[PDB]
Amino acid sequence: PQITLWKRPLVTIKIGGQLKEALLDTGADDTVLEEMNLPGRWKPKMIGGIGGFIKVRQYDQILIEICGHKAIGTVLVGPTPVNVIGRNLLTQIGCTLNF
Amino acid sequence: PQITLWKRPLVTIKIGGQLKEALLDTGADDTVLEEMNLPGRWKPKMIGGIGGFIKVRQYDQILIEICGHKAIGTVLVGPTPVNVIGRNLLTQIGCTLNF
Numbered sequence: 041p042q043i044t045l046w047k048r049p050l051v052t053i054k055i056g057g058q059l060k061e062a063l064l065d066t067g068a069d070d071t072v073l074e075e076m077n078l079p080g081r082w083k084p085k086m087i088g089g090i091g092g093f094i095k096v097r098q099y100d101q102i103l104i105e106i107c108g109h110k111a112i113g114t115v116l117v118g119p120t121p122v123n124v125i126g127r128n129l130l131t132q133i134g135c136t137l138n139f
Numbered sequence: 140p141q142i143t144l145w146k147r148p149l150v151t152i153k154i155g156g157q158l159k160e161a162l163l164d165t166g167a168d169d170t171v172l173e174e175m176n177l178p179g180r181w182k183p184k185m186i187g188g189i190g191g192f193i194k195v196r197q198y199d200q201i202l203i204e205i206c207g208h209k210a211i212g213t214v215l216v217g218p219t220p221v222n223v224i225g226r227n228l229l230t231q232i233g234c235t236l237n238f
């Protein structure tokens with residue numbers, strides 16, 4: 041689809057078999073989701089945003105469907121203010137900016 | 140133009156007589172620019188993201204040219220690590236997400 045930006049670009053995602061809402065975020069290198077339970081192993085990591093750094097659990101090679109498009113990649117889980125879909129998965133679903 | 144997301148979507152902007160690099164950021168409600176000494180009145184604001192909040196100065200009706208496309212709107216100035224072009228201006232240059 042073509043998504044205009046007068047509203048937040050929020051979409052439904054499926055991860056771990058659960059549905060969630062997430063923000064298509066071209067300013068995010070990585071995908072960061074709010075606290076949740078995810079199966080499989082993970083490694084602790086740090087990520088920095090506009091306000092500083094937070095601790096996150098890094099899950100590798102996670103299946104995640106974004107607005108009907110499938111991706112498999114790294115997902116960070118931690119105290120983010122909003123579920124954000126970052127460029128590591130936006131590229132997988134073929135997302136571009138156009139003007 | 141069409142901008143793929145393999146790398147950060149950095150573009151050249153012109154604001155306050157200065158050229159700068161900034162992110163086309165669909166995850167940003169507002170536009171947030173690195174510290175710069177703009178003239179005119181402003182009002183304080185707090186914006187939150189990953190890591191917490193930062194204090195910024197809100198300037199209204201600021202002229203900003205984004206990759207050759209003129210716009211005018213609210214610009215927030217503060218200790219952000221990156222120049223961020225938010226949705227308030229992306230809509231003005233006709234920017235969409237497409238996949």
Ligand SMILES: CC(C)CN(C[C@@H](O)[C@H](Cc1ccccc1)NC(=O)O[C@H]1CO[C@H]2OCC[C@H]21)S(=O)(=O)c1ccc2ncsc2c1
Nearest residue numbers: 067068069070089090122166167168169186187188189221
């Ligand atoms: C978190 C989202 C919802 C909101 N942000 C926008 C998002 O694109 C930020 C932009 C950014 C900030 C600092 C350095 C690089 C890029 N990216 C981000 O945090 O990415 C994380 C995850 O991947 C990593 O790569 C990049 C950094 C890591 S924001 O900056 O906090 C914001 C902007 C306007 C605004 N107006 C009212 S609130 C408000 C809040």
